[PDB]
Amino acid sequence: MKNILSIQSHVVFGHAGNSAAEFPMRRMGVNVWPLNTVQFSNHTQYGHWTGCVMPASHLTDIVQGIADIDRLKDCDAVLSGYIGSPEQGSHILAAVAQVKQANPDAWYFCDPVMGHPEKGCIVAPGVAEFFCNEALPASDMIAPNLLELEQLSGERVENVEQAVQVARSLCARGPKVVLVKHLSRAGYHADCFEMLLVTADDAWHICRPLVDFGKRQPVGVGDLTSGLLLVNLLKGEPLDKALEHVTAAVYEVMLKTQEMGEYELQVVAAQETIVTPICQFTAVRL
């Protein structure tokens, strides 16, 4: 069994962060050690929530506890997404460093969440700086959307050719794999959702139809995309097959959500189409 230490938010009702990624990743047959950074009643896009943020020192305490039972060496990858403060981020990188000492083959998959290209930045002060100068150099894979790829590089990205080159420039600072999870305006077609998977030797481009949720877009699509890519890569899937599975599995969860008229991403109702999607999307090697 492959084992992921996933350090993300937890919501009691609904799905976001670890609450969006844990059940789909376990459904695919990979273990998830869910190290919850918060415990909130619901995600923040309802405009109100109750609960609490865990002390940043709690995150490194947990990791020490797993090392104390000599199980930290079983961790094959660390996954991070939304980060509420630079202090929390520094403790997540301390967890990554501790895991790699116990297991030198462990990967750090960083979703550098900063916001949606259509809405703008939603991160707390200092978090953008933390991703650019701290998380990026320590990462083995990163999954920036267009807004995050531009923030991390400090460059405008206008098309796929540029996105590949800019992704390869971020790679030189640390990660070996870059997933441009949301191309946005830099894509080929305005009527299509697009993603790009980049390595040193290759780049794959993939397309799928847009899902119009209108005013209330469900939270967790990025969290699910990042988590499912990590699972496919840990399971030894070729990069093109990995991208194709993620693209179709996420799309099917989104369709199920819209069909049920729900605001929350329906990760449990769509579980059969997560492992075996009906929809098939094919990547194009650039």
Numbered residues of the known binding site for substrate = 9, 44-45, 223
Judge contact between 92 and 59, C-beta under 8 A. yes
- Give 96 or 183: the residue with its C-beta nearer to Na ion: 183
Among 69, 156, 172, 261, binds its own copies (CB under 8 A): 69
- DSSP strand E in 54-191: where? 77-80, 107-110, 115-116, 120-121, 141-142, 177-180
Structure tokens at 173: 């600072």
Least separation in angstroms between CB 14 and its own copies: 8
Q: DSSP 3-state assignment of 27?
A: helix
CA distance 27 to 253: 13
- List binding-site positions: 9, 44-45, 111, 143, 148, 181, 208-211, 223
As beta bridge partners, residue 105 has none
Q: Do the Cβ atoms of 85 and 56 come closer than 8 Å?
A: yes
177-180 vs 141-142, strand pairing mode: parallel
Residues that bind Na ion (CB under 5 A): 187, 189, 192, 194
Q: What's the length of the chain?
A: 286
Q: Which two tokens stand for residue 194?
A: 């697009």
85 binds its own copies (CB under 8 A): no
Q: Decide whether 33 or 109 has the Cβ nearer to its own copies.
A: 33
Min dist. Cβ of residue 48 to its own copies (A): 6
Instruction: State in angstroms the smallest separation of the CB of 185 from its own copies.
Output: 33
Does 8 sit near its own copies (CB under 8 A)?
no
CB 190, min distance to Na ion, A: 6
d(CA 198, CA 112) in angstroms, rounded, equals 16
State in angstroms the smallest separation of the CB of 121 from its own copies.
25
- Residues at the interface with its own copies (CB under 8 A): 1, 5, 10, 12-13, 22-23, 26-27, 29-31, 33-36, 39-42, 46, 48-52, 54, 58, 61-66, 68-69, 71, 268-269, 271
